[PDB]
Design a protein around this ligand. Sequence first.
Ligand code: CL
Ligand code: ZN
Lengths: 312, 319
Amino acid sequence: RTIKVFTTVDNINLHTQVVDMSMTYGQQFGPTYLDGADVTKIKPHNSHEGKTFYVLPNDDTLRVEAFEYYHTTDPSFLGRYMSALNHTKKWKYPQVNGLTSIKWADNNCYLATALLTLQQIELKFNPPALQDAYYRARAGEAANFCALILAYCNKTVGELGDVRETMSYLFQHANLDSCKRVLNVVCKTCGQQQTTLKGVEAVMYMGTLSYEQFKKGVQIPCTCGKQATKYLVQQESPFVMMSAPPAQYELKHGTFTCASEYTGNYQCGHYKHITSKETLYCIDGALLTKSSEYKGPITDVFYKENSYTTTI
Amino acid sequence: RTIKVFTTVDNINLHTQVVDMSMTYGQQFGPTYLDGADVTKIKPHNSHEGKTFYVLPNDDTLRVEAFEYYHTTDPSFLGRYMSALNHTKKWKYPQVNGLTSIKWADNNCYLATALLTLQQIELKFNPPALQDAYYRARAGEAANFCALILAYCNKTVGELGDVRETMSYLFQHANLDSCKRVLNVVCKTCGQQQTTLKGVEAVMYMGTLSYEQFKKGVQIPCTCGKQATKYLVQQESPFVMMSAPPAQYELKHGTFTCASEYTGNYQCGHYKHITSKETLYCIDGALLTKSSEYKGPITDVFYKENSYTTTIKPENLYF
Ligand SMILES: [Cl-]
Ligand SMILES: [Zn+2]
């Protein structure tokens, strides 16, 4: 009438639990999962002896273990993660030019170019759940990592994601504390004004795709009301993310790390990934295409960096 | 000869230009608009001097200004926004019971009840374009606000629209991040199954018009012969939107804030706005009608809210 099972929220700290065989797992634990499979509606079987089941945090011990692994206090995070994992566990994660991509399914193209981008930039995540899942994503088992991204971004499978918003969500769970960016906006109604940015804001800019033009100076509307020019004074980061509203942009080999292109119907479009190696490669899910240059509606371009100091 | 004019993409940053009267505006600016009207193939007049013209974001600086004002990156937005403005500026926006409505034109009835609804629920738009246009609409100048709605929804003037679909796009451009909804699904085999929604999904529901029935519990499908009950556990929002397919529904004074009624089918129909004050007012364009109760094919009901926590104990759910 009883079996011994183990319940967990992080698959690290296991918890011995006795369950009645006449009552389902849902009546005893609430929502319960056995390796991504929903077993809430199922009564415990003989073959479930000693197996490990995923459950939701419903006491002090499970909530603190879920907080130390996922770095979140959201009580619904694990459920939204299990809901996405039920789909991401079915996706194909082929190795494309040494990078782990995703075959297209349920508008996951923004997740693919984000996953392909993360494998080319230096970035260390703070939540242990994100670190462990990314390491496995490198090996072609990205089901846990994609379900975590969807949970952290609070997006469901099938929704159109934004690469810039997605990376921004991931950067806020990454160790970018030591990153620093120094900017200076020149004009005439103000003259000069220098600001310093730290963390996530130091590695992202919206308005220009060219990292070189960001150093030469871009024109922005300043509240002063003049022909204001913003230029990069100092950059201390392992990478930079340049983003802009989509227009026709020319990518050349060796001048960047990787980029993202957005095409199709704008409300519900499609993302592609362009990476720079010995030449330019376009990764569209599992499809690989190589060319010397690339012309298209680019939205995000990533560049490598260590320490920049302007000479102007 | 030459005249001086201003170009812009947001009507905030005005870029001075000198145009020759021998060539069209298109040859000098690209696609150009004057208060919504396409003047691309029109040559400048002497009376055009000093006027402000809309152009398409054809450089990086213009695309930055459009994104900071409209909060969109769709390159087709400004053109579609101007195409609608050339129609919405000719609409009449009457004031009905202290609320700005719209006179019937181009099937704008769905825009009218949405506009009247936005004047009664606590909502804060993120794009500065929507904030500015809303405040002008509250006064009586809703041409820009209506044109922005059509552009943000990818609907053209004349097309019959959906209020529930329209509010979704507008809520998507509003700060609903501190809005939370906790639900509970109770199946005899599944036990309890709680879920938490945030943002737009925390203030919209499709299945029932009654906020009380949502709290009492509604029947949702589990299998072809087995159903389960879903009820609201926790709601943190200034309002909620209860939507359901059109059905005869008794609206009573004091139980709701405002509601939308729809007569017709998928292909063609008409919207009316019901609002609760000291009594029920049916606003149909410029028409005003007063009645104690109201029965009709209601499709959307809006309720005020601040913080709600259920008093249901799940073991007693079916009592
Ligand atoms: Cl109408
Ligand atoms: Zn109508």
